Amino acid sequence: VKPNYALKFTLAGHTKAVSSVKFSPNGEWLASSSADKLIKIWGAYDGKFEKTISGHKLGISDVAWSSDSNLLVSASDDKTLKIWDVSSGKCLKTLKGHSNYVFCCNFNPQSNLIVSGSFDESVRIWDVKTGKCLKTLPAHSDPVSAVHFNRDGSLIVSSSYDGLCRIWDTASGQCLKTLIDDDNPPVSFVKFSPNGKYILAATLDNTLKLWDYSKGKCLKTYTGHKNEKYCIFANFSVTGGKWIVSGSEDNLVYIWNLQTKEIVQKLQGHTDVVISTACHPTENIIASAALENDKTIKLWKSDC
């Protein structure tokens, strides 16, 4: 019926707001990005500080892991992405092409492609093997807030303040679906569900919505949190009960029962906007990250 997530770790290394936290697919590590231009690597079960990765010239808005947990990609206001070797902390390549801030990034399951979204209103698909840009999609008419691959990587979903979610055919670059809703709220985050039949979208009206993007039908709406100003990550939690997890502008982590739409737990502890959350791949552990007045990552643990 409910989870029981409890504070177990606080991770304080960043000297500015933390922008994004991701768990490595193998479950050993957590990566944090920050406005302080650094990536930090943390042990996922012990909270232990591992490594500082540096190189970006401005703040970093996003980071993501390759499937084998050996590579990272980050997205920076310096108009580049960077591919890092996690073991040595070295930058293997700087992906230049975007003409404004790069805001969000992600590997496909195979991890031979990277997708990136930018303030230049384009989605870009990059070759992990060469570093070269493969496709430039004129995806949106306002900043791209999120990019995500589906389970087998044949599809990309993108989101924008233009109010659209777009489903893209990875192979061809064509658009299979544009999703639009009443009063055109800006879409601040989007991601496929783990089975790939649905899409989870946050709008800056304090709302997350589960959509069947094929029929364009909204199946579930989640409210109660606060989301009017920041692009806040949300997640499907699957290791125990089936939850929806999100940060919120009232410094709380919100958890909902996915099917009933009810708030099942609110996590208190941060002292600023919770901009990012992530769900561990095998354990009932949540990572959360907060902004300038907090600067820290928190790890929480639950029996279900």
Binding site: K16, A17, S61, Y101, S145, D183, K229
Partner: protein, 60 residues
Amino acid sequence: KQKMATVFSQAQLCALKDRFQKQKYLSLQQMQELSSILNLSYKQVKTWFQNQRMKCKRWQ
């Protein structure tokens, strides 16, 4: 609460975005000249720039 595309023309928004991509902070004088060119009000242009700088954010 409704999209600016319901009050501005597509030619006007493309012109505003073109400037915003080149500089996101226009001087008061530049905003007035722009409003003059686009046949928009100075307040409308100043408001549009303020709102555009506020859009896609991970931190304050």
